[PDB]
Every structure is written in C-alpha cells, then in structure tokens.
C-alpha cells in the first residue's frame, strides 16, 4: 500500500507515517496532497501530541508542510524531534505534506488529522453555456461585501470559438484573477492578472476557457466586468495554414509582445515590432546575438512563416536592420527549442535594408506557443519588425483536441502499462500542461511492451495524436505505433498500406516541442500509443488525442 | 542595548526580536539562555500568535530553540514564516534561543514568554561541611518514590584534601550522576556516570567537589551511597615534585587508563600498563606511530617525569618493548599538545629491553590532566609499562587555586578592558573550564591597552597566576605583566629587580597547555593581567589566580 496520495478533505481524515505508532521505515518518501472541493475553503491540520522523529538538526528525518500543492509552495513548517507542530491552516484550498527518512534509525513517527477550515468566503462560481453573456464580479460595479473564491468557466460546443473581452478590470496577494486554457490547475495557465492590469482579448478554440477569481475584504473596492461570445467556425478543406497571427492586425496584444531588453531612450520598445509600423521598431539595449524578441501566442498555435523588416530611425533617418536570425520556440515559455534544419541550427536569411519585407516559410509547420526571433547578423544595429503566420490546429476538419490538455479527459480516463513512481498522477501524461511526463517503471523498456492509453469515454472519430517529450537526461519518444479499440478489449493497430504492417509514426526531436500526427479517421473510444524508439534517457511522453464526435436513414 | 542575554526564569518574562512589533533589523544574531534557579525545574515557552519571519525555506531568517544551553544542544525547533511555534517545554533546567537575520528584507518578528514549568520532581540538594559523612540518595538502599534533581557539593577549608569514595552505585537518559571539579556547569566535568558504572575514588584539592544527580520514576530501583573525608594536608617547602601519581599504587584507577586500541586476544589491555605488572602489559591492535596509551589524571596535575619498561609475553616468553616515544598532553582531552624541546617535537629515549626501567625527567614540569605516551620506535612490537611522576599545584605553600577554575570566583568578579562580543559571558575567561577564552574587541590591540581583571572579593595573599591560551588562528598570550590593588583604584605593577621595571612574564607556547607563573607574595583583592605579546591570531586568554588567605600582637 504505497504511502502518500491525494485526499479530498470533503470528509475529515487522517495521515500518519506508514507504520504509526509502529516505528517508520528507513529510506522513505511519502508525499500527500490534501485538497478541499471548493476554492472557497481552506485545509486545517492538527497533529497528535505523541510525535517522535529523529533529532540531530532535522538533517536526516523530518516532516514538511508546504502551502498549496507541490514542493515549490512556501514552507509552512519543517519539524523533527518530539514536538508535534502547531495547527497549520492553509491559505489556499490545498496542502502538501512530505515525510523523509534516512537510511539509519527511526521512531514512532507522526499522525495528523485534516479537515476543511471555513473562512467565511462565498463560492460564487458559475458555468456559462449561452451564446453571449456577461461574466463579472457579483454586485459589480461595486464591492460585494464578502470574500470570494469563484470559478467561471465558459464551455463551448465543438466547432465554436470562445471570445472573451474585458470592459473594466480593477484589482498580487489579496486579489487576483488567473485565466486557464482548460480546467483550472489541469489545463495550462494562460496568465495571472491583478491590479489595473486589464487583460487583452482572448480567442480560445480549446472548448473551454475558465477564470478563477479571488477577493478580500481588505481590498476596499474591486471587481471586473467582461463579455464572452461563442462564434461558430467552419473548417474548410481548401484552407492554407498561412494566415497572419496578428502583429499587424493587433490580434496579438501588446501584453503578449516582450523582449530581452530595449534601448535606453524607450523609443524602440517591443510594442513597435509590429510589421509595417510607422514608428521606429524593436531594438535592444545592446546589440548582440544574446538578444531576442518574444511573442506569446497564448494558445498552442501552428507557426508556418516568419516575415521581417528593418526600420528607419524616425528621429534621425538612419537605417537599421537584421540580416539573419535563429528561431526559438516553447510550449510554456520555460523549456526552449532552437529550430533546426538538418543537424545544426537554422540561420534565417532576413533583410537587405530597412523598408522592404522578407518572408521565410518554415520547411514544415511548427507547433508552439511562445516564439523568439534571435538576430545573428545585422546592418548598423538590431532593428526588427515582424509578422508571424500560421493557423489553429483546430482549423483542420475533425481535429479538435479531445481533452488531455484541457482536463475534459479526467485523470480516471488516463491509464498506462507501467509507471515509474509507485503511485502515479495520471495528469502527468498531459500534452503541454503536465509538469513532467509519463515515464515507465524501467524507462528503458523492450519495444511494444509499454504503452499509454486514453479513454475518451464515448465512441468518437479519432483522426490524430499530438506527441510530446517529458520535462522532468531528457526523455522523448522517437518512434511509435498506435492501436485503437471500441470495447476497451478488442484492439486494432493503425496499419500502413505500403508495408502492410503496423504503421510506425515519427515522434519528437525535442523534449518540449510537440508534433502532430494525423491518420485516416477511425472510430474509437480507447486509443493507445506504444513507443518503439526513444532518446538515450528512455521513454518520456506527453499526449493529446485529436478527433471529433460521431454524427441519415429511413 | 545588545540583543540577547541570560535570564533567570525565577520570575516569568518576555523575549522578542529586537524591534518587535517593529520590523527586526537585518544582519542579526540574538542568542538567549533562559534558566531555572533549581535543577528540579524546567523552562516552558509560549509564543505570541502574531509571528512573522521571512519565508522561502528558512534558508535566510529563522528562530531556533535548542534544549539545554549552547548551540550543540538538541534542536527542539526551527521556525520561520507566519506560524508561531507550539509550546516548547525544556527537558533540563535551561533553554537556548537564537534568532538569525540575513542582509536582505524582514518582518514583524516574534515574541515569547518564558516561565518555570514544574514537573513534580523534588530538589533534595545538600551542602557538606563536616569532616566526614555519607553522601547518598534519599531513602537509600531503596527507591525514593519521587523524581529527583539534586546538587551535592562538598566544601573544604583551604589546605584540606577531599576524598570521595563510592560504596554502591546502581543507576543514560533517565538517570545519571555527573561529578564536577567545582560548581556544576562552571567548573570542569570530571565525568558523567550512569548504570552500574561504579566510579573510582577521587582526591580533589580544588576546595570543592560536587555531584549533580537525577532520577526518574521510570527507573524501577536506583540510588547510590558514597563516603567523603576531609584530610588535612601540610605544605612543606622542602618538597620535591616527583612523587608517583599512581599507576603502580593504583591511585590512578583502571577507569582512568585507556588507549587507541588493544590486541585482539584482550591479553594486553591498557589496565596492564601499570609499572612492574607481572601480567604482560599494553600493546595495541596494530603497531604504528599512530597509537597511544592515555591516562586521565582527572584533576589539573603537574607532570615532572615518565618511567617506562617493556614486557615479556607471559604466554610465550617473547620480549617486546618501546625504544622511543613522544608525549601528548591536554587539559580537557580534546585539545592536544605534543611536548616540544626547542623547535621540533621531543623524542624520548625509552627502553633497551623488556624488564629494566627507564626514567625521563621533563626539562621543566608540565601542567596537564590527560597524558598520552606515543611510541615511535620499538623492538619486535609495542609493549608498554608506565609510571607518571609529579605532584599537585597545591603542594607548593600558599598556592591554592583561588576560584576561576572552580566557580568560587563568580562571573560578577571577572572584568575586562574590552571584550569582542557586545554582551560577553565573564566565565569565558576561566582557566581550563571556559569553552573558548577571553578575546578583546580588536584582538590585535596596542600593548598595555587591554587587560583582564579578577576581583578575589577580600584581601588575599596572591602568589601566582596560571595563564592559558584560548580555544575558540588560535590566540594565546606570549608575554604579559601583572598589576595588583587593594582599593580596586590604586594599582602597582609587579616589579622586576634586575631591570627596575614592570616584570614581563613568559606566557604560553600553546593555546591549551597552561603555564604557572609565581612571584613574591603580595597582598591583593584585585589582580590584573596585561598582555604584552601574542600569537599571530591576537590576544586570547584564560586565567586562574594562585594564593591564599591572610592570617600576633599584644
């Protein structure tokens, strides 16, 4: 019975060092997460006075309570010895406990009790179904005289884009509103907002977009008002994936554009990098190949071309421009890939002057969120104007992301052949959003032996998979096969007609930058990816499934 | 107002981070000791809920409560964040608190309240004045149905040796009895005893010898019975400091003799190293120059000669013997000095055979407690029989140690020109017993500017000083002068007749091994040592004063 887990504190419970009161084993790594079922609520822990753990200076054995979830939450306490810790009340809806044991000597251990601590706050959450409506604070334009902690999620039928736009925003410890590309703390974070930091319009085709929203009576007046729209799309076949993603049009907001630095005078800001801008452009604080213009596309986007120009100094008529550059991309803005062509990097031939435009279509389309252009050579200085071109992965017909990334596929529908940790969070396998990835028990396994499986929950038309490496000697899958099933019990491998043989799909060349693999549309409730080849570090994988719903007679 | 100190919890009090509730300063090192006036008692602390200290993982700012006194007591708790620690009850009569602040950002801090926690235990302490009597547990031979925590101290008029000898000893966490060469936790520890570890006879001429004695109801039957005697001595002038210290006679107990190792068969134990023993001798487990025979003389003794022999294997008639050796000495068994002759070490020419005895008189007498002989060359193997010769520093006439080592001179009677720590424990200046030593504020001072001073408390005949280096780049004083005074206000330097000039005494050649300096007996209530020269690390010093009481007409 593997120690640790995730407990839903709706019902008060206990957590104790494995043996307790029997002495705890050596070489031990229990971690728990205690969560309340409402954002509203807090967790409270009270320890049993009979508490014994090894002394010294907690160098060796100890208990650690952290505030939130994961090891990078703030440390509420680290204890060891014979004194139980004092009541720990969470500040969020979640707590993380970790027990550590050295390979030498032990003691009785510890027992605590968890339960929901009620603060006074109200859960004002609402789901939004309707074609158009207002999402706002209760009582807006004024203060709702109560704490709040609320989920607003927009849900859209497939083929419908969600447009969210904020009218007023008036709020980072007391108040905040984060926006999620999915279910909160399951989908990726689009961004945390607070203050009068009024957030730019968002267009999501993920099928959900949700806001978590928290307030305090200590903030005198605060609230927000937004509008949402559900606009029908129509996937053409005759459709090129080369539309501009919106530097010139502005569909990419200033908020989304950033850079390593900018000139001291502040007259060559990032927000001037928009293609065809009549006011200078982007230049950094120095000119070196260690510099970059960053655009956050917010949602997982397909990039197919880059177009760049130089810039004429509006105050001096000088002509600055980039002559060549590298491209650097990431799904989360933390893990980065420099675009390759063959073995080594790809140097893009850019401009010959300030005014004229130079286009560069990528070799093949690249799936990402954050984009960095990186100047390598230039004339005079580093000037830059830019458009990005591509389209949505959803613009293909029957090509919806089916829930791994958002959270509409639950943890319960995500299974695997083996897993390396005794007790393994199924959300670890989610494309982009998972903090690490799926690793099997011996991650250097024999091919066709290991697999990850997704239960879509009802029979769907499945048309592709998106495959990604693993974040946390960095594993990714180099080649794989796919089987599908309706019964969960009778399975067909996706066949290759040339070879007459289970088709062997290409995988990733990188632990972060994912790859879309499509195939003839088949009916399936269950899909399985079986790795065949991988990087030297072993199998590490994240996955999403592409497809759409089933639909005549007389 | 320097933060930290020593508080006597007889009256309940408060301790808070300097500013509290004003934010605490950066770069901060407050340490406190909270002590109960009876061994009997425990300390309890309760914290104020309004507790704020910097987070992260207590890497930077924190509070530490340790169980006893000093940094090497067990850690009862280390806290940081916004959660005050839970009640901490001591296990002894003392607690140690330390607050740490980084050079970056702070918070409100902390406040706690201290007071005596009553456990139930009885303080059965007695002082012993009388010529002869029994020191024992209450109710001995049986269990006193109560916890106990008691000081037994023997006090002797000067010129009287104290002899303590134990009849029965029947007791290391629940029960113990430590014996102190002085006032407990002020004088040196002679040794901690517990179990049926029946302690050997002790002869102390220090003027006090005391026992601390602790029991528990969890130990079913325990107690001890001892006898003490006060025997009059008479200091001769015609007296050589060359008496045997008691390997052959046995006045040095087996308990006191030890070694790096011993042969595997257990037939050459340390307890066979007694001079003229008819059963083999001492041999180690290997034969190498990294080996030693150790004798603990218990009290600060004067060593003047070493006599050694070899040994004939009683079971095989072979002849083993040491040919040369080095001598290694320490006042506390932790800090060691290898005896020198001129620059380099002193190799002693020992034996030429097993049977015959070889004497070696030291160059000049050496003041120590722990002695190690260290074989360098030998015939066949390392065999050793041994006598140590010398006498008591007290065997000189009017040469009593006047209280620095024992604690009969109080902290209040110990003053200095400067001191390096803002708030400076006066007991730091005590010969042998002090854990570190007296250091001035800039320990590289201008000569005659700094001084340490001892208020003997009434006008005495002072006849010498004992001077020692400092334990905690190791300071000792190489040359010094001494002034004395009756008024505390009119001061005479001890003059040198040859030079007609304040006499300049030789100091130490070592941070541990002390040196006795005597002089014409003068009347004095106050004595001052003024360092003139020192080691490269600066002034560091410990001191005792030698002398005796004032006494005719018609």
């Amino acid at each position: 019975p593997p120690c640790g887990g995730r407990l839903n504190s709706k019902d008060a419970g206990y957590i104790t060092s494995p043996g307790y009161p029997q002495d705890y084993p050596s070489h031990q790594n229990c971690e728990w997460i205690v969560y309340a079922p409402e954002p509203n609520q807090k967790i409270v822990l009270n320890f049993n006075p009979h508490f014994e753990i090894e002394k010294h200076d907690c160098k060796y054995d100890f208990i650690e309570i952290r505030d939130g979830d994961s090891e990078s939450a703030d440390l509420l306490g680290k204890h060891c010895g014979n004194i139980a810790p004092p009541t720990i009340i969470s500040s969020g809806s979640m707590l993380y406990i970790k027990f550590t044991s050295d390979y030498a000597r032990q003691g009785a251990g510890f027992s605590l009790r968890y339960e929901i601590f009620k603060t006074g706050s109200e859960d004002c959450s609402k789901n939004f179904t309707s074609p158009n409506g207002t999402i706002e604070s209760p009582g807006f334009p004024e203060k709702y005289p109560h704490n709040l902690d609320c989920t607003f999620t927009i849900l859209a039928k497939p083929k419908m884009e969600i447009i969210l736009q904020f009218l007023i925003f008036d709020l980072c410890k007391y108040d905040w509103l984060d926006i999620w590309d999915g279910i909160p703390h399951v989908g990726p974070l689009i961004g945390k907002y607070c203050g009068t930091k009024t957030p730019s319009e968002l267009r999501s085709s993920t099928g959900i977009l949700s806001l978590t929203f928290h307030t305090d009576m200590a903030v005198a007046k605060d609230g927000f008002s937004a509008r949402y729209y559900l606009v029908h799309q129509e996937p053409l076949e005759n459709f090129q994936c080369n539309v501009p993603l919106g530097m010139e049009s502005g569909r990419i907001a200033n908020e989304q554009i950033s850079a390593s630095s900018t000139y001291s005078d502040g007259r060559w800001t990032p927000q001037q990098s928009r293609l065809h801008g009549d006011d200078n452009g982007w230049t950094p604080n120095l000119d070196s190949n260690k510099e970059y213009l960053q655009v956050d596309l917010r949602f997982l986007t397909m990039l197919t071309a880059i177009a760049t120009q130089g810039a004429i100094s509006r105050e001096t008529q000088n002509g600055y421009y980039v002559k060549s550059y590298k491209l650097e991309v990431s799904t989360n803005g933390e893990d980065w890939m420099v675009y390759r062509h063959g073995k080594n990097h790809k140097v893009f031939q850019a401009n010959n002057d300030a005014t004229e435009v130079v286009l560069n279509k990528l070799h093949a389309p690249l799936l990402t969120r954050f984009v960095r252009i990186r100047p390598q050579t230039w004339h005079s200085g580093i000037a830059l104007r830019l458009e990005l071109f591509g389209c949505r992965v959803t613009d293909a017909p029957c090509s919806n992301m089916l829930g791994m990334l958002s959270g509409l596929i639950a943890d319960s529908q995500i299974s695997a052949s083996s897993t390396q940790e005794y007790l393994w969070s199924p959300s670890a396998a989610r494309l982009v959003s998972s903090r690490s990835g799926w690793f099997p028990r011996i991650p250097q396994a024999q091919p066709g032996e290991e697999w990850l499986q997704v239960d879509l929950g009802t029979p769907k038309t499945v048309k592709g998979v998106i495959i990604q490496g693993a974040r946390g000697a960095r594993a990714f899958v180099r080649k794989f096969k796919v089987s599908y099933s309706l019964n969960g019990k009778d399975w067909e491998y996706i066949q290759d007609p040339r070879t007459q043989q289970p088709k062997l799909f290409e995988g990733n060349m990188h632990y972060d930058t994912p790859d879309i693999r499509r195939f003839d549309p088949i009916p399936a409730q269950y899909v399985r990816v079986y790795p065949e080849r991988w990087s030297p570090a072993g199998i590490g994988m994240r996955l999403e499934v592409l497809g759409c719903d089933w639909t005549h007679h007389h | 107002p320097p933060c930290g100190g020593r508080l006597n919890s007889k009256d309940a009090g408060y301790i808070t981070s300097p500013g509290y509730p004003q934010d605490y300063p950066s770069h901060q090192n407050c340490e406190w000791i909270v002590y109960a006036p009876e061994p009997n008692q425990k300390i309890v602390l309760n914290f104020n809920p309004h507790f704020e200290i910097e987070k992260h993982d207590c890497k930077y700012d924190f509070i530490e409560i340790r169980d006893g006194d000093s940094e090497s007591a067990d850690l009862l708790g280390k806290h940081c964040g916004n959660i005050a620690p839970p009640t901490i009850i001591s296990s002894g009569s003392m607690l140690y608190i330390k607050f740490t602040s980084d050079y970056a950002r702070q918070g409100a801090g902390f406040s706690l309240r201290y007071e005596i926690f009553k456990t139930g235990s009885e303080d059965c302490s007695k002082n012993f004045t009388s010529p002869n009597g029994t020191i024992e547990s209450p109710g001995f031979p049986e269990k006193y149905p109560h916890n106990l925590d008691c000081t037994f101290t023997i006090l002797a008029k000067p010129k009287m040796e104290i002899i303590l000898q134990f009849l029965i000893f029947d007791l290391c966490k629940y029960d113990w009895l430590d014996i102190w060469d002085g006032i407990p936790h002020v004088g040196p520890l002679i040794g901690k005893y517990c179990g049926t570890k029946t302690p050997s006879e002790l002869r102390s001429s220090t003027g006090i010898l005391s026992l601390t004695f602790h029991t528990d109801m969890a130990v079913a039957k325990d107690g001890f019975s001892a006898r003490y005697y006060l025997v009059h001595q008479e200091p001769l002038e015609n007296f050589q400091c060359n008496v045997p210290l008691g390997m052959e006679s046995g006045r040095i107990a087996n308990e006191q003799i030890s070694a790096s190792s011993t042969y595997s068969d257990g037939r050459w134990t340390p307890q066979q190293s007694r001079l003229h023993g008819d059963d083999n001798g001492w041999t180690p487990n290997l034969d190498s120059n990294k080996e030693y025979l150790q004798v603990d003389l218990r009290f600060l003794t004067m060593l003047t000669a070493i006599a050694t022999q070899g040994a004939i294997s009683r079971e095989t008639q072979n002849g083993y013997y040491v040919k040369s050796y080095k001598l290694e000495v320490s006042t506390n068994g932790e800090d060691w000095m290898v005896y020198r002759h001129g620059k380099n070490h002193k190799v002693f020419q020992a034996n030429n055979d097993a049977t015959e005895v070889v004497l070696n008189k030291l160059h000049a007498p050496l003041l120590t407690r722990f002695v190690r002989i260290r074989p360098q060359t030998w015939h066949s193997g390392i065999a050793l029989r041994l006598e140590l010769f010398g006498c008591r520093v007290t065997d000189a006439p009017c040469s009593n140690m006047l209280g620095m080592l024992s604690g009969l001179i109080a902290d209040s009677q110990i003053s200095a020109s400067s001191t390096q720590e803002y708030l400076w424990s006066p007991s730091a200046a005590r010969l042998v017993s002090s854990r570190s030593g007296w250091f001035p504020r800039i320990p590289q001072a201008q000569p005659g500017e700094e001084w340490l001073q001892v208020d003997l408390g009434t006008p005495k005949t002072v006849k010498g000083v004992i001077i020692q280096g400092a334990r905690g780049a190791r300071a000792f004083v190489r040359k010094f002068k001494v002034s004395y005074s009756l008024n505390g206000k009119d001061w005479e330097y001890i003059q040198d007749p040859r030079t007609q000039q304040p006499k300049l005494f030789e100091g130490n050649m070592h941070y541990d091994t002390p040196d006795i300096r005597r002089f014409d007996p003068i009347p004095a209530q106050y004595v001052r040592v003024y360092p003139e020269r020192w080691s490269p690390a600066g002034i560091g010093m410990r001191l005792e004063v030698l002398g005796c009481d004032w006494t005719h007409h018609h």
Partner: antibody, heavy 124, light 108 residues
Framework: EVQLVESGGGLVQPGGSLRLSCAASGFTISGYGIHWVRQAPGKGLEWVAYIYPDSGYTDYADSVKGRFTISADTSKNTAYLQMNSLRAEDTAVYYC?????????????????WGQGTLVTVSS | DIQMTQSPSSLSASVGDRVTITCRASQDVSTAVAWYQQKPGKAPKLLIYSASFLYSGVPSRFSGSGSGTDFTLTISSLQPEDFATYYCQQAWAYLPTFGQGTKVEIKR
C-alpha cells in the same frame, strides 16, 4: 509532590448534568495528558476520555462521545469532565490519571498517577 | 477499538507461589502494554510499562513479558499484600483500553 484530587461527583437525576473536577498539585497540567477512567460498581476499568491541554487534543470512548466534554483551565491547573444526558450505566467511580508522554515513547498512554476517584451515581 | 481479554479472570494461590496472569490483545500491539494493580476501594497503581519494564517502587518480584498479541504478568513469590485485581492496558492505539481484570486470592 504530584497529586490529583477529583471533586464534584454525586447523585443525579437521569437525563441530568454533572461536572467533575480533577485538580493537579505539584506539577503544571499543560504538557501532560489528563485521562478520565471510570469503574462501574465492582466491574473493570473503562477508559472514557482524555485531554492534552497545550495542544487541545481531546478524544473520547464511543460510550460517552457526544455527551461528555473534557476540558482544562491551566490558569487553575485543573481539568474538567462535563457529563450531560446522564444514563444509569454511567454510574461509577471516576478516576483522573496523568500521562507523561513528552520525550518518552515507551510511556505514551501510560497512566502514572491516579486521583482518588469520585463517585457518580445516576438514580431517580 | 482494540480489545484486551485476561486469563484467568480469577485465581487463588499460596504465599510464595509463582503466579501468572495472561492478557491477549485483539490485534498486534508491539510491546505497548501496561499493568496496573488495584486493591479494593483504592486507585490503581502502575506496575509495568512497555510490557517488561518495572515502574518505580514496584517489588522486583513482579515482572512482565509479552511481545505482540499475548502478554504475561508474573508474581514470582506471592505475598499476602499482593491480594488485588490486576489490569492490563494497551498503550498503542489512539484510544486506550483495559482488560476486564484478573482477581488474585491468597491461599492460607
């Protein structure tokens, strides 16, 4: 000298209420465990409840849970046991006993000192 | 709750006889078992803690063994004053419990 002296026991109407007092002399009760153990006339010892006043940890035998409320006033160095909705079968002598657990894993839930007992009788 | 049951529930035996009370716990209890002695109309007295450790003042003629689910008190040289009722208690679970008790009678 460590002592416990109960008081406040006696005859009481069924359904009625009553409040025992365990009064510590010789030591501070906070930072010990104070247990109540009852003994029905000529029958064995039943553990009923306990308190650890520093923390507040309390707990109760099912036979009394919901009806009894152990508590402690450390300014008065006393522990209480407030019994409500009293049934006949609560009739017994009620001992309070000390548990010394801090630093003593082998003596956890061991009751080293016992009060003299007070008699609670439940009759119409 | 962990239940403790004692064996026998009463015994008579002569002065100087060795005497053996037994206590079986309804599930493993490591050595966490205490023995008390109750004389009639008096509060119980701790005799043994942690299965085998004599508490202060207790005549060494008392001793405890046991190690898991069966435990045993032993009065080696019975005395008149040892007339009493003897309780075992488990000191392991969150909630303590006692045995129903063994009543010792002296045979004269």
């Amino acid at each position: 000298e460590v002592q416990l002296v109960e008081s406040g026991g006696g005859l009481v109407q069924p359904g009625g209420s009553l409040r025992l007092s365990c009064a510590a002399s010789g030591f501070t009760i906070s930072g010990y465990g104070i247990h109540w153990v009852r003994q029905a006339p000529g029958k064995g010892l039943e553990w009923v409840a306990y308190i650890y006043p520093d923390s507040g940890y309390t707990d109760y035998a099912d036979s009394v849970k919901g009806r009894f409320t152990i508590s402690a006033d450390t300014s008065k160095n006393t522990a209480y046991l407030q019994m409500n909705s009293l049934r006949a079968e609560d009739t017994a002598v009620y001992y309070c006993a000390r548990e010394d657990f801090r630093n003593r894993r082998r003596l956890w839930y061991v009751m080293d000192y016992w009060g003299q007992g007070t008699l609670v009788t439940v009759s119409s | 709750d962990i239940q403790m049951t004692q064996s026998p529930s009463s015994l008579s035996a002569s002065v100087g006889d060795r005497v053996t009370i037994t206590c079986r716990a309804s599930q493993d209890v490591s050595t966490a078992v205490a023995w008390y002695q109750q004389k009639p109309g008096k509060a119980p007295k701790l005799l043994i803690y942690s299965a085998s450790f004599l508490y202060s003042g207790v005549p060494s003629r008392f001793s405890g063994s046991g190690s898991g689910t069966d435990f045993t008190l032993t009065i080696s040289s019975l005395q008149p004053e040892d007339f009493a009722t003897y309780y075992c208690q488990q000191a392991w679970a969150y909630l303590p419990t006692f045995g129903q008790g063994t009543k010792v009678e002296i045979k004269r």
